[PDB]
Amino acid sequence: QPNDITFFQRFQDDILAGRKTITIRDESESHFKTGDVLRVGRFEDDGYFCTIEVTATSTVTLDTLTEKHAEQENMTLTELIKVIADIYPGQTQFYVIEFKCL
Ligand SMILES: [Ca+2]
Numbered sequence: 001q002p003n004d005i006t007f008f009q010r011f012q013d014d015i016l017a018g019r020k021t022i023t024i025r026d027e028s029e030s031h032f033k034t035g036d037v038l039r040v041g042r043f044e045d046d047g048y049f050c051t052i053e054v055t056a057t058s059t060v061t062l063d064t065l066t067e068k069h070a071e072q073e074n075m076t077l078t079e080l081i082k083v084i085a086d087i088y089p090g091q092t093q094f095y096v097i098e099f100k101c102l
Pocket of ligand 1: 082083
């Protein structure tokens, strides 16, 4: 059973505990959609750790990321923008995937 999506393992505990319920991705992962059931692995070792159900998707830009996006990331907004500047340098167009761990 291959993984459909991966996360940095520093997110694993937040996802399993339900503290992190969205992910913000670039055009590479814009194909996920409400109702998808996805096997999730760690980015570093591809260890499966959960199956998620996508509950909502939306587009977002750097300048329209909100406090509520940050809360759903278990982050402050300033922290979230810094994460995005590191993982998606120079990018401004993103896609929000909201999910629940099954
Ligand atoms: Ca940084």
